[PDB]
Design a binder for this molecule. Structure first.
Ligand code: 7XG
Length: 358
């Protein structure tokens, strides 16, 4: 990787999120979105390092702070869609062509810290909230499918979550130091999703009933000792970090325990490795993976990038490379790989954007 360009957005506030559109059509240039201040902005990557500015969506409320975005597509038309959310607790579905807000969703109106789309169903959107809950939405029928919370749910802000490969289960994490597993391939949850697709408010009198899921299928506070701010599945294993200069690779149960036989009472975890780094001990810093999950990237609070090659026989054998540029000194909140892995974008607390090309 070599650094080929940078720019800075005019708001001078942190960019909290960046995502390449992995649903961009064949023959179209690569496009990524950034979120920070009260806006979302799209850029196109071109040759000779050019980052071409397209168009932003700017919230009507100057006090909105967007924290997260996620791409999907319209399941009928195939056209890409961009979901954004933040401090106002409003999910907006944006048409990236025109930057029009097509529609929006509100739960209880508390800050949304992350959005993720289901890996097999482009209509299923997961939000994680300052109010300690996760919410699963069906953006085809505009329904809240389920809320994941309760006293055995998270007891402080949820900061991150991730679906596994097939979208059979979710791992969430947050300010309570815990990582929690929620299965969504239960008979109850599969039925709820089916019913969400059968719901049309114009053809019935009932409101749509959301599931209240009050018990995770596994919980641990034994991995980290501070706010857990990013989580990703790596097959049946988990990658997660806190502010302790480490990403931990771990699994529920003992070494030979199958993830789908784990009981909610399981008290053990197994640590398969840990990737240490420096100067990333402030709260709220995300790591990202490429499409194939061959690579892992994390930026630190002084503008250094760490990239791990996970194409090795066991997690602890990961090979680290580091990327620095003398002008890049601000905290990197998130990174994104292009779908082909040829470009890595980093975004920063000073509103700067850094492009690295293979
Ligand atoms: C990015 C991220 C990463 C991982 C998990 C996550 F959940 C999030 C999302 N975060 C948005 C919120 C937030 C974070 C930072 C600031 C802030 C203010 N000033 N600065 C530095 C400056 N230089 O201005 C930074 C303000 C609000 C955090 N919540 C819990 C308070 C969660």
């Amino acid at each position: 990787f070599k650094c080929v360009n940078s720019l800075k957005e005019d708001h001078n506030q942190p960019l909290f999120g960046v995502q390449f559109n992995w649903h961009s059509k064949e023959g179209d240039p690569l496009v990524f979105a950034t979120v920070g201040s009260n806006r979302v902005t799209l850029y196109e990557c071109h040759s000779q390092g050019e980052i071409r500015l397209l168009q932003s969506y700017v919230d009507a409320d100057a006090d909105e702070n967007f924290y997260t975005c996620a791409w999907t597509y319209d399941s009928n038309t195939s056209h890409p869609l961009l979901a954004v959310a933040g401090s106002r607790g409003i999910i907006r579905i944006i048409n990236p062509i025109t930057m029009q807000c097509i529609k929006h969703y509100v739960g209880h109106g508390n800050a949304i810290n992350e959005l993720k789309f289901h890996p097999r169903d482009p209509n299923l959107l997961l939000s994680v909230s300052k109010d300690h809950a996760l919410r699963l939405w069906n953006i085809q029928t505009d329904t809240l499918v389920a809320i994941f919370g309760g006293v055995e749910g998270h007891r402080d802000e949820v900061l991150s979550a991730d679906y596994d490969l097939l979208g059979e289960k979710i791992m969430s994490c947050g300010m309570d130091h815990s990582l929690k597993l929620w299965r969504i391939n239960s008979k109850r949850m599969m039925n709820a999703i089916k019913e969400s697709y059968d719901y049309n408010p114009n053809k019935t009198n009932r409101p749509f009933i959301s599931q209240k899921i009050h018990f995770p299928d596994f919980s641990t506070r034994d991995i980290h000792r501070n706010y857990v701010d990013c989580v990703r599945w790596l097959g049946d294993l988990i990658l997660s970090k806190s502010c302790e200069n480490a990403i931990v690779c771990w699994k529920p149960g003992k070494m030979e325990d199958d993830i789908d036989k784990i009981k909610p009472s399981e008290s053990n975890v197994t640590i398969l490795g840990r990737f240490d780094y420096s100067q990333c001990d402030i709260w709220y810093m995300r790591f990202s993976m490429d499409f194939w999950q061959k690579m892992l990237a994390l930026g630190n609070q002084v503008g250094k990038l760490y990239v791990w090659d996970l194409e090795v026989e066991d997690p602890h054998k990961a090979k680290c490379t580091t990327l620095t540029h003398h002008k890049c000194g601000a905290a990197i909140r998130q990174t994104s790989f292009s779908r082909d892995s040829s470009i890595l974008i980093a975004v920063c607390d000073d509103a700067s954007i850094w492009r690295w090309d293979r």
